Design a protein around this ligand. Structure first.
Ligand SMILES: *[C@@H]1O[C@H](CO)[C@@H](O)[C@H](O)[C@H]1NC(C)=O
Ligand SMILES: *[C@@H]1O[C@H](CO)[C@@H](O)[C@H](O)[C@H]1NC(C)=O
Ligand SMILES: *[C@@H]1O[C@H](CO)[C@@H](O)[C@H](O)[C@H]1NC(C)=O
Ligand SMILES: *[C@@H]1O[C@H](CO)[C@@H](O)[C@H](O)[C@H]1NC(C)=O
Ligand SMILES: *[C@@H]1O[C@H](CO)[C@@H](O)[C@H](O)[C@H]1NC(C)=O
Ligand SMILES: *[C@@H]1O[C@H](CO)[C@@H](O)[C@H](O)[C@H]1NC(C)=O
Lengths: 390, 390, 390
């Protein structure tokens, strides 16, 4: 039929997407690393319960008890000797030692007797009239374990520290063993089996103009800005040939290594994952619908060109075949038998990789600090009430 | 060659994808917010170790020691004065005060002497015959910090509460400072610098029929059902013009803010992320293969139409050029020089945004409650054994 | 115009993507499950503070105090009776019972008096000359709660255990109640309401050659290797008809259920999510650009074929219409009115599902173990100093 009507004029419009300047580059970096191996941390503790009484009667002003929990933390020498001996050495215990024996409370003891384990007893009595009564009860303990040295930059210089449960960073060197002491405890770290590198290498990062840079290393994921040193517990990163601002760096917060994450935080991460995957379902389904549309259009146009070129559908199927259309849509089939040019510019589609992610927990749950807290709790448990050993 | 054979009849089928009624809408919401700023929480503690003895001999029934750890929590006035003074004020200490001086144990003390810090000593002795012996040792401490007010709805009314480590929700008002006391401790919060909003705004949510609604705000991600108030620690959300069911709301579980997440929980979230990314790799690779197929088909069909229209490949390349096919596939090139209609209905592809996610930790690790726990632990540490100060 | 120049020869190249042997299969598995329901765990504790003194003067060697905190954990019978009674039963308390009454310190008490709650007092005095002074103060407590039985395989045999805060796995059977005791505490679990299944079923997993297998169940996500039993807290999985290596299995680490995740771990998971979503933005945007390209090419080619077939654009639009091109691009419109063959091989696009993920926290925050720790802390709080009750 058709008309002399010419209700136009029309012109096909191309689909134009909103551009995105995102791309996956290699970024050259100076990377300062640190790794530790083997039993490199040794913790010892030792203390004496000394209860020294005198019984001169209610009338004597010297009657009474002077007690004390004397801390006797081991020396570096003694802590090493314990470390190879697997025993903590100690002085003598004394129960109900009165009169001349009570002087054992004031002798400079030799730490002779060594133990697999030793807890003290809160002994005290004063029932020997006109005499002194001495009670002496020792406790000691030792654990050898593996500590993880971490990094920190202050003044622009990356140095090694050991984080303690209360947040104090213990400066650590890499040649000589570091040894320190708090009250009853003595700690010894030896830098053997520990390595601190500085390395010219590369990182696979996503550059995306708001440019931001989203980078990955081993199990760490982090933004890597320009002219700023990015420090994470065991690795710092700098852009090669870029000038770090001396201080004001991007460094890990020690608090986040001491403090645990709540169940609400992780559930919130799960919910964010759900929201994200909803977005991904939307986008992927939209692309799916697009391929449906292109399928329809390409089919109609294939019908149009095919009625002219009967060898078209054949090469389309890879089958040696010619067609004859008995219908606008239905057709029948019969058989019988340089430079490249790319019209599409399709590039390699980046498939997301499986993410190695580090989960290490809080510092208080490290074996050594757990041992320290356990020791303190045992001391509290055993000082609950005085025991009469006479 | 070809045959009179007509092994058909065939008909091209269009690709039909499984539909998905997912879409990203703006949802109008009434949102109740709350924000806090500055040092708004003040914690003080104060107590007296009073050891009051009398020495009348083994025969006197009055001989012995009455000791007590009297809690003396500061008043709101005294806590404010400490807050501006940066010192905790206290009464007098007394070591080995016997006879007439021992009466200091029973005088109504004036809290005169103020401290940067103060811990008591467990002094006790009774060696003054026919006399009383008084020992008095004070302890006090103060910390000014920043607390985060949270929201809770019971009876349909959204109100402000302060969560304590044991789970108790302290009702908080926004005009007058709230002050309370537990044993030795006194806490003072002032509502200045704190703001509670109610706001008509919008949220970007994913609506997807099983309709569910997956919503995001600041660092919070949450389902927003119909006719139900959704409360999260610092923000509640309601559908505008919808009738909340008075109670039975969707509110955050206080437990999940007090209790930490295990390493197994987070590792499990990581594994779920891995499973998810495997699905995404599958889908994206499938789409990739689809573009390969369309590339092949479009190339063959382009060859078919090009042998008829020699200006086709030119406009395909944007190059001014005509072709001549010396082969079914090989060809040669030479140069020389309204309403819109959209066949594709391609819409803007939603690219997933980078997710702002809140990670705040457990309540016990808040600075103030950490200070309280530290104070209690110090008190335990110093009450381990009696010290004779005579 | 055009030339006798034939600057070729060219040939269209098809887009070839890098293949990926990833696919979503059903894996047949033998799955050992375990579920618990109702109040199935009962915790009781009970202890006696016994301070037994004698006052014979400074001269008598028998003068002094023998004190003790005697643990008296309930029996299985008594713990069950408490469980149904909601009261913990106890012996008699005694304050300042001297002379003949002091013998109550050494009578075999009958646990007659029962309590909603009971804490002891550290009473001690010795002011009755030539007499004994007895102080007796009891404490008891009971909590009924819900414990979650977990699985563990050693020797290839999957068995049920109850994890305790210090990491010890308590072997649990499914018929008779299990009962054990530590110092002051007694615990009773009854296996009623608890179920341990072994089941032939299937899992939806992603098989992807490096083949690895990434699987999901309820809220658990885990790799399921070949010929290895994969144990998770409440469910183990084995490939059907495959031979598990007797031991050396892939089992959950008990530590990760006792130890919490740091805020740095979760923030790191967030950053990994950001990196991932950057990759997804890149890929999705690339596919978008691809559809733009195909839109352009298909439009030009549609113009080429349309000037020959004026019914083409009509069937392309589903509109009954014929075209006439007054321009290389502009055109005008007028109206008036078997086996299937698939050229594309497009398959069902897998849309990622919303991930159910379990977040359970640490074992120490379970209600029962929280109750135990609270009880111990109360005992510590009340033993701080002796109180004279005379
Ligand atoms: C895209 O990125 C390049 C660097 O690769 C930059 O030169 C250009 O300005 C950017 N353009 C836009 C629009 O982001
Ligand atoms: C942390 O502990 C160390 C060692 O006992 C001590 O020197 C330091 O002052 C403590 N710091 C804090 C903030 O508690
Ligand atoms: C799709 O969503 C619309 C609302 O946008 C609703 O009216 C319709 O029933 C839905 N259809 C299906 C099949 O989900
Ligand atoms: C929490 O502590 C407050 C203040 O000491 C107290 O009033 C309340 O009873 C406690 N609640 C619980 C469940 O421990
Ligand atoms: C692809 O997977 C099949 C099993 O489905 C396997 O037989 C084949 O070797 C694999 N090929 C490649 C290249 O991965
Ligand atoms: C854990 O506690 C149980 C019960 O008190 C005890 O038998 C076991 O030895 C403890 N194990 C460790 C490693 O502390």
């Amino acid at each position: 039929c058709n008309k002399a009507q010419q209700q136009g004029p029309y012109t096909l419009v191309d689909y134009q997407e909103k551009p995105l300047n995102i791309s996956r580059i290699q970024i050259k970096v100076v990377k300062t690393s640190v790794a530790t191996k083997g039993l490199n941390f040794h913790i010892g503790y030792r203390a004496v319960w000394r209860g020294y009484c005198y019984n001169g009667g209610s009338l004597d002003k010297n009657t009474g008890c002077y007690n004390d929990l004397i801390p006797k933390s081991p020396t570096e020498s003694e802590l090493r000797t314990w470390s190879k001996s697997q025993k903590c050495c100690t002085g003598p215990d004394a129960v109900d030692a009165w009169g001349s024996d009570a002087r054992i409370c004031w002798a400079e003891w030799k730490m002779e007797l060594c133990h697999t384990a030793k807890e003290l007893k809160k002994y005290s009595n004063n029932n020997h009239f006109a005499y002194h009564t001495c009670n002496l009860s020792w406790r000691c303990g030792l654990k050898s374990t593996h500590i993880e040295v971490r990094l920190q930059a202050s003044g622009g210089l990356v140095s090694m520290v050991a984080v303690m449960p209360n947040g104090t960073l213990i400066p650590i060197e890499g040649t000589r063993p570091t040894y320190w002491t708090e009250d009853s405890f003595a700690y010894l770290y030896d830098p053997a089996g520990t390595e601190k590198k500085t390395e010219s290498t590369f990182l696979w990062c996503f550059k995306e103009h708001i440019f931001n840079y989203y980078c990955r290393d081993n199990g760490y994921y982090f933004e890597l800005p320009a002219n700023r040193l990015v420090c994470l517990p065991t690795s710092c990163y700098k852009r090669e040939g870029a000038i770090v601002n001396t201080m004001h760096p991007n460094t890990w917060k020690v608090s986040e290594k001491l403090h645990s994450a709540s169940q609400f935080d992780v559930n919130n991460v799960v919910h964010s994952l759900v929201y994200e995957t909803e977005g991904l379902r939307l986008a992927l389904s939209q692309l799916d619908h697009r391929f449906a549309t292109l399928s329809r259009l390409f089919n109609r146009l294939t019908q149009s060109l095919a009625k002219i070129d009967d060898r078209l559908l054949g090469t389309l199927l890879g089958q040696d075949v010619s067609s004859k259309f008995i219908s606008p849509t239905k057709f029948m089939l019969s058989p019988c038998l340089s430079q490249p040019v790319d019209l599409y510019s399709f590039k390699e589609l980046w498939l997301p990789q499986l993410l190695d992610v580090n989960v290490k927990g809080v510092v208080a749950d490290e074996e050594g600090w757990s041992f320290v807290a356990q020791s303190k709790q045992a001391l509290i448990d055993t000082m609950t009430y005085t025991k009469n050993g006479g």
